[PDB]
């Protein structure tokens, strides 16, 4: 790439920081409607039953979001609040569900790091 | 075989030692898969006197001190004219690790990557800033700084080499 004419045509441009969440497309976290609350398995090295809610969003997408924590109240057609963040083990799950927010209760009996799970103080 | 190596260790006030990485490097044999320890030790007093050294042995501490005995026969002196900083900027690659060194104001502690910062904080320089361009390696990095501070000249020996009598210098 000489300074003359292969480069005052253009070098090229890198695209963007590609969006790591194609939904949520305004901004960070977005209200959701539960459609399925099924349970899938990770890839080969792990072994678990991870419990994800496939959730329709208010944006216009439908997307399978993970449910953190131990206990979960989430039945059919409830309302959640999804956020970004890639669960590695599950192919397709791109998102999380916030706990302690609207119609998704905090986890049962947790006393270490409660702000990630929406549990008020005991004691 | 006199014992306990008290006089023979030479208590190392003169050269202070640190590792900069101890990677376990392993070879496989017919019987299996056995490892030795490669440690990289940078020795040097804070007077301006440092040098790297690799070593590998099946023990950790014999690899460290073995790399030290390899290191304390490999010393350059640092051309560091002013108030513990550098004469001029420099860059010198070794292998595929390029190192840009740049002198600093005296109100600046040494800021560099871990291998470069290790061989400069052992070099007793206080005021430098060296970016590393290239490898993630630690050995060729540090040895590239050593080559990057051999080839560095003061003003007195450049004034001696050119023959110009003296000016153009604040101090």
């Amino acid at each position: 790439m000489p300074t003359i004419k292969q480069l005052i045509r253009n070098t090229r441009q890198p695209i963007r920081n590609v969006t790591k969440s194609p939904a949520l497309r305004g901004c960070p976290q977005r209200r959701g409607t539960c459609t399925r609350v099924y349970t899938i398995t990770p890839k080969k090295p792990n072994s678990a039953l991870r419990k994800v809610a496939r959730v329709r969003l208010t944006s216009g997408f439908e997307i399978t979001a993970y449910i953190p924590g131990i206990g979960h109240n989430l039945q059919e057609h409830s309302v959640v609040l999804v956020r970004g963040g890639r669960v590695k083990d599950l192919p397709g799950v791109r998102y999380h569900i916030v706990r302690g927010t609207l119609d998704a209760v905090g986890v049962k009996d947790r006393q270490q790091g409660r702000s990630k799970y929406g549990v008020k103080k005991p004691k | 075989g006199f014992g306990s190596k008290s006089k023979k260790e030479k208590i190392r006030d003169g050269f202070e030692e640190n590792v900069v990485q101890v990677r376990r490097v392993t070879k496989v044999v017919k019987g299996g898969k056995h490892m030795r320890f490669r440690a990289i030790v940078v020795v040097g007093d804070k007077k301006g006197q440092v040098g790297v050294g690799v070593g590998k042995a099946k023990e950790v501490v014999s690899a460290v001190q073995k790399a030290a005995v390899d290191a304390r026969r490999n010393i350059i002196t640092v051309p560091m004219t002013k108030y513990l900083t550098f004469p001029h900027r420099n860059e010198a690659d070794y292998g595929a690790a390029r190192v840009m060194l740049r002198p600093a104001a005296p109100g600046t502690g040494v800021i560099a990557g871990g291998a470069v910062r290790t061989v400069l904080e052992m070099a007793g320089v206080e005021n430098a800033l060296g970016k590393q361009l290239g490898s993630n390696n630690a050995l060729n990095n540090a040895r590239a700084t050593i080559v990057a501070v051999q080839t560095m000249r003061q003003f007195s020996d450049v004034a001696r080499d050119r023959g110009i009598p003296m000016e153009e210098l604040w101090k």
Binding site: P2, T3, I4 | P87, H88, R89, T151, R153, F155, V158, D161, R162, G163, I164, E168, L169
Partner: protein, 134 residues
Amino acid sequence: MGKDTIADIITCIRNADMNRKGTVRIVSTNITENIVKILLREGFIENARKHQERNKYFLVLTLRHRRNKKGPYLNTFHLKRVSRPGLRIYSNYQRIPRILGGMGIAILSTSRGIMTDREARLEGIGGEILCYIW
């Protein structure tokens, strides 16, 4: 006789002493004559001699050395071009660089003649930076 008459001399310098040979033969144009005139007097080289071969006046230039070493010259010469043909560079009397604090010089084309940083910093003039050596 290629595209550049200044990478001519300069690349003959680098290629001269990187093979440790202390002798250069180059053409003697006006700007080469001026560069070796402002370069012998700055302690980098030893002597420049004009002569002729087929009535074509050339410069043979003797480089510096020291004594019998691993390499008989210690300080590697490190010549470098800046204002390439096709990318001209130009500086005021502000931008004009003190190379390594002053251990190098930046030979450059003033309206006076071609100077160094000493002889263009005191003038206050600026111009096209040919090349800086260090």
